[PDB]
Paper text:
Steroidogenic acute regulatory (StAR) protein related lipid transfer (START) domains are small globular modules that form a cavity where lipids and lipid hormones bind. The ∼210 residue globular START module is a curved β-sheet gripped by two α-helices. The concave face of the β-sheet and the C-terminal α-helix enclose a hydrophobic cavity that can accommodate lipid molecules. Here we present crystal structures of four human START domains, those of STARD1, STARD5, STARD13 and STARD14/ACOT11.
Group 2 consist of proteins containing only a START domain; group 3 proteins are capable of binding different ligands, such as phosphatidyl choline (STARD2/PCTP) and ceramides (STARD11); group 4 proteins (DLC, or deleted in cancerous liver cells) are frequently de-regulated in cancer and contain Rho-GTPase activating domains; group 5 proteins contain two thioesterase domains; and group 6 consists of only STARD9, a 4614-residue protein with unknown function, that contains a kinesin motor domain at its N-terminus. Of particular interest in the scope of this paper are STARD13 and STARD14, the family members for which the ligands are not known. Based on our structural analysis we propose charged lipids as ligands for STARD13 and fatty acids as ligands for STARD14. All structures reported are relevant to disease. They are down- (STARD13) or up-regulated (STARD5) in cancers, mutations in them result in metabolic disorders (STARD1) or they are linked to obesity (STARD14;).
Numbering used by the authors:
A (entry chain B): 352 to 366, 375 to 592
B (entry chain A): 346 to 584
The structure:
Amino acid sequence: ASARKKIRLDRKYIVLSVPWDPSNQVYLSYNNVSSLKMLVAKDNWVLSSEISQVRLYTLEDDKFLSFHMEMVVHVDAAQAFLLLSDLRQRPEWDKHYRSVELVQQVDEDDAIYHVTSPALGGHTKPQDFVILASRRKPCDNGDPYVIALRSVTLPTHRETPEYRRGETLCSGFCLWREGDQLTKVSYYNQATPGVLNYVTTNVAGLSSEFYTTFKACEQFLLDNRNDLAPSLQ
Amino acid sequence: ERRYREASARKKIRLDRKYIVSCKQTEVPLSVPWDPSNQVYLSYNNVSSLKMLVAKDNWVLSSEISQVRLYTLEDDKFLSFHMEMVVHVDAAQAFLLLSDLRQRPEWDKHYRSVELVQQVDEDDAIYHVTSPALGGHTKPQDFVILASRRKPCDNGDPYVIALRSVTLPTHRETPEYRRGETLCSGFCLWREGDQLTKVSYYNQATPGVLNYVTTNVAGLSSEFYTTFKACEQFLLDNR
Ligand SMILES: [Cl-]
């Protein structure tokens, strides 16, 4: 199944950014967040695998092989929200984040980041991304905390030969409070063309780097479970 | 139209911040226990509450498209809204069609399914409704709703179809669905002539769907209008 499933997915899915403008920062931010929420609610998510109560789902759209991972972590959702919404700290737990640079603090809950990523799948250059991150605290009615990521273009931050400029359409974290010191943590990625080989390898079960990274995510949250620094920034 | 989109986006942020602390069951009777000994008053109160909501003086007209109107009331504990249009159907027939909650899934995508739980009397019934997951959720919602319908007492008065959440020992919350509550919703229908009816839908407080309400009210989405349009086409198809 594995090798064959991988090759089928590759054959199916082989071969996204929006211009940023200060005059539409509020709308772009809404759309960033709203897109992630809508992705969560799509009706055709299918469980691909489970390993140690951690679940990997896919959505095989006509355009995209979307995936998401879910786990339950013994950390407070508000704390998980501050820890995960600071993308500067993501290189610490996520190997796929080689570096992170804050381009533009847009407001309290929105920022543009320059992200670089190690090359994977034969490339002799790393990838880079210019990403709008938009975070929202929910109403206390059971809605999730949301940290939404989508690629944006800026006249000053176009691609240079140092990196393959990639794009991500709709990615990020949702966190649902499940109890005192219990959070359901999910990471979603709708479409990131430049890493499809890597996705299909993971989704088919030839690799478990997604599981490994999500384990390091949990450990990062637990290790920083009770840090005050996030809430005082 | 960038400017107008930016305004909408700002309005949603304002509203969301304003109601970020949801109204609780201790503060307002989002649901009430179903008590068959009190069935008469429970239905009376359901109708009277919707009549009072209608008569509130602080409704503000927030938008209009094709002479369909969306009003809002930014109350202190919750954000109430109501939609209003006039349809080329007899009020008496609209009354039968809109009181039949089991038919509501045919025109309202928010009603995924409806089960009649108890017919209390000719004009009052309790239903179990399921609703599709909105953005940010993976489980559908369910509700247990008392629907009480009344004809107009005098001329000028509306037909009233009042909905309010109730609880029952046979339909307690289950892990399969996120249980929602509605405080006071439903339809008022006024005769505007021969086969003209003013059709209004009201929703005082459904705290579980706040984000969806703010998106629509802010004008970033038009799903309220799309559903109300389908409502119209349902009524026209069923004359
Ligand atoms: Cl959910």
